[PDB]
Amino acid sequence: MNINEILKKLINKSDLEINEAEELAKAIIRGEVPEILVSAILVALRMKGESKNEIVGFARAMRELAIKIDVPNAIDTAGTGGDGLGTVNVSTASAILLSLVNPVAKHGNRAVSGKSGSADVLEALGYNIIVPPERAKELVNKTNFVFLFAQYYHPAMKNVANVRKTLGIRTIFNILGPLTNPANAKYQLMGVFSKDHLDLLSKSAYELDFNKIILVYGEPGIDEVSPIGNTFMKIVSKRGIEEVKLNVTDFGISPIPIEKLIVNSAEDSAIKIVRAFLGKDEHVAEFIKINTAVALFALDRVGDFREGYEYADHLIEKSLDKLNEIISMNGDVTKLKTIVVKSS
């Protein structure tokens, strides 16, 4: 593994082989490459345009260097983020409904591009987002749910923190979070923030050994099932990649006004979700249900998305109680109660 040829090869706009990319990623994440070179590598990679092998190679590298736990049967709903609209944390919400019928290993981080990421809303609900691996396995067996905080499950990533911050631009690292579930979940719903990335990340995923991952991109440009119109998805599995185009009306619902799904803080998002669980906010609930519907389809619990949406309706009615039992076992339920009044 020579850093120089690698760089020259990227400067010449030549895609790397999977093993090349993985060895490169391993060296970078281990902190064995000078910042000047790490910076050049990431910039060349972005200007060349990352290819599937490089995404696969980097993903495998991070998985191998991360703190792990074994729960392949679990499902994750994390998306790449980056759309920037600041909508309510729908995948975290959706992760709660799913824990009622399947173990859930939700990989996530805090935010900065909206001051309300998956980790922030959980904390605001009273959950203790910092879970040790041994304790994490126990929580999933008892409550069928656990949140895997990325900062803490991928420590080696600190070796690239300075370069990434100093650069201040998007790099290959900004789209790998969802492909590096610390629990090696085989089933997943992964939102991508751009149509272009849909094709690249789905081919990469195809080689990252999932049982079934569904990647989606929804209008007007979010990494979720679209609440206002069309959604473009890729259904990846051992068999291949299936393409699917869907409109929000296919869920047997009318387009939701995106203004009702935007939040301005962690607590506000926490309240939108609890109100949705209480039946006091049908727009947020719908958004949650259309997303959970596709996840249900990924688990093959329903035959189609309409069925998935209907099934999700039964789940959302038991989600507040499920949320209470999850938090009570890892966090402070008094905060959950507070948020409950604050929405009642």
Ligand X SMILES: O=P(O)(O)OC[C@H]1O[C@H](OP(=O)(O)OP(=O)(O)O)[C@H](O)[C@@H]1O
Return the axis-axis angle of helices 282-298 and 305-316, rounded to nearest 10°. 120
Please state, in angstroms and rounded to a whole number, the distance separating the CA atoms of residues 212 and 292.
Answer: 15
User: Among residues 78 and 271, whose Cβ is nearest to Mg ion?
Assistant: 78
Q: Is the dihedral of CA 283, 284, 289, 291 positive or negative?
A: positive
Residue 162 Cβ vs ligand BE2, minimum distance, rounded to whole Å: 12
Q: Which stretch binds ligand X (CB under 6 A): 87-95, 127-135, 232-240, 246-254?
A: 87-95
User: Among residues 84 and 132, whose Cβ is nearest to Mg ion?
Assistant: 84
Q: Which two tokens stand for residue 134?
A: 């041994």
User: Is 109 among the annotated ligand-binding positions?
Assistant: yes
Rg (CA), the chain: 20
Is residue 78 a contact partner of residue 177, using CB atoms and an 8 Å limit?
yes
Is residue 148 a contact partner of residue 107, using CB atoms and an 8 Å limit?
yes
Cα–Cα nearest to 208, from 38, 91, 63, 65: 63
User: Among residues 103 and 227, whose Cβ is nearest to ligand X?
Assistant: 227
Place of tokens 């409550």: 143
Return the one option of its own copies, ligand X, Mg ion, none that residue 47 interacts with (CB less than 5 to 8 A, by type). Answer: its own copies
State yes or no: residue 109 binds ligand BE2 (CB under 6 A): yes
Binds its own copies by CB under 8 A, chosen from 1, 14, 30, 34: 34
User: Is 180 among the annotated ligand-binding positions?
Assistant: no
Residue 3 Cβ vs its own copies, minimum distance, rounded to whole Å: 8
Cα Dmax for the chain: 62
Binds ligand BE2 by CB under 6 A, chosen from 73, 102, 128, 151: 151
Q: What is residue 72's DSSP assignment?
A: T
Please report, as ranges, the residues that interact with ligand X according to CB under 6 A: 77-79, 81, 83, 85, 87, 89-92, 108, 117-118, 191, 222-224
Q: Residues comprising the binding site for 5-phospho-alpha-D-ribose 1-diphosphate?
A: 77-79, 82-83, 87, 89-92, 106-114, 118
